[PDB]
Amino acid sequence: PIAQIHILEGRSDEQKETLIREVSEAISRSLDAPLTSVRVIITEMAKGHFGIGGELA
Amino acid sequence: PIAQIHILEGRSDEQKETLIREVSEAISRSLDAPLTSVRVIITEMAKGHFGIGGELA
Amino acid sequence: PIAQIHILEGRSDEQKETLIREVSEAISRSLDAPLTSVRVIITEMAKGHFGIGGELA
Amino acid sequence: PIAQIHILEGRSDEQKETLIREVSEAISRSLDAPLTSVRVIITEMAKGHFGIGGEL
Amino acid sequence: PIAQIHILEGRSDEQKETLIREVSEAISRSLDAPLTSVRVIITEMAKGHFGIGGELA
Amino acid sequence: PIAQIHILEGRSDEQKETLIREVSEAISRSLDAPLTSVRVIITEMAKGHFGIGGELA
């Protein structure tokens, strides 16, 4: 499984490290897939690049 | 936050609902983001559409 | 410019054709880019494949 | 509805703001979807990262 | 490396296998990356779902 | 055809230009599509943003 997660910029390296591990374990557990087969890509969004309802967040 | 997860075809409806819930909670805990703000997209891959090392998986 | 739009299943062909035209024109005018350079990809999501707050939408 | 738009780098903040607003109404109107449910992600591409016909 | 390729539906299975092998090798040679680390995802587009210049493909 | 390739950060501009060219030709050759129709997007991943098996790669 391959996961791409879009998140707002501003979290620490440590926090993103935690995100990758926790999500990867979640995918492995949910799907009964080998942990080693799970890849996660974190994509950061700048504040001026993410809109909800046509307006900036 | 928005997660798009590519997975191989063959999973049950039950596994995919669990995947969405478990990845969403993992995201929520890891980033201290409200659960209600987490969105997850499941994308299924057919066996002839996923390659590893230039060969079909 | 390349736009990928994830939408829920259930929309008509005209609605999607209109979606493609209006989004392409909106991109073209906002960015002063030639309409002919604008590409739009519609990706339909099955009901069990889209999550909000850890639950199906 | 969620739109991810890949655009070339170099545009200013006001133009990207306009892009977000204009695309969001277009999606909303076309699909008879609530404006507030429409999400737009702008992804900027550096000039050395986007190829057409094998060349930048 | 992870490659996602959007193409219009209508190609043969053989044709998509060739695409996956050829793209994987091109990535491998260009990056001096082991072929085995290269993953390719093919995403097919339905005829009514791809727009160029505001018009259907 | 549109290919998005996620690669780890750190390559020079000329190597990525080579990657774009070689992948584009492979796609053109495999699908018998006019090269002018092939679009390729390079997306660099920071080291702290790419996980394999829940750990940074």
Q: Which domains does chain E have, with CATH numbers?
A: 1-57 (3.30.429.10)
A1 belongs to the catalytic site? yes
Asked if A42's CB is within 8 angstroms of F52's CB, the reply is no
CB A44 within 8 A of CB A12: no
| Cβ neighbours of F38 in D, within 8 Å | 51-54
Tell me how far apart the alpha carbons of residues E3 and B6 are, in angstroms, rounded to a whole number. Answer: 12
CB of A41 less than 8 A from some CB of F: yes
Amino acid, single-letter form, for residue C32: D
- Chain B touched by D5 (CB under 8 Å): no
Size of interface A-F (CB pairs under 8 A): 44
Between CA E42 and CA E37 the distance in angstroms is 17
Nearest by CB: B21 against C6, C48, C54: C54
For residue F42, list its beta bridge partners.
F5
Per the residue annotation, which of F1, F15, F18, F22 is the catalytic one?
Answer: F1
Contacts of E41 in chain A (CB under 8 A): 2
Nearest by CB: F1 against E2, E7, E30: E7
Residue B56 zone, left/alpha/beta (φ > 0; ψ -120 to 50; rest): beta
Which residue in B3, F51, A8, A19 sits closest to C53, CA to CA?
B3
Helices (H), chain F: 13-31
> If you measure CA to CA, which chain B residue comes closest to C46?
B42
- The experimental technique behind this entry is X-ray
For residue B37, give both structure tokens: 């703000």
- Residue in the block written with tokens 């060969």: B55
Query: Entry resolution in angstroms?
Result: 1.9
Q: How far is CA C54 from CA A5, A27, C50, D40, in A?
A: 15, 13, 9, 21
| Exposed / middle / buried, residue E34 (Cβ in 10 Å: 0-12, 13-18, 19+) | exposed
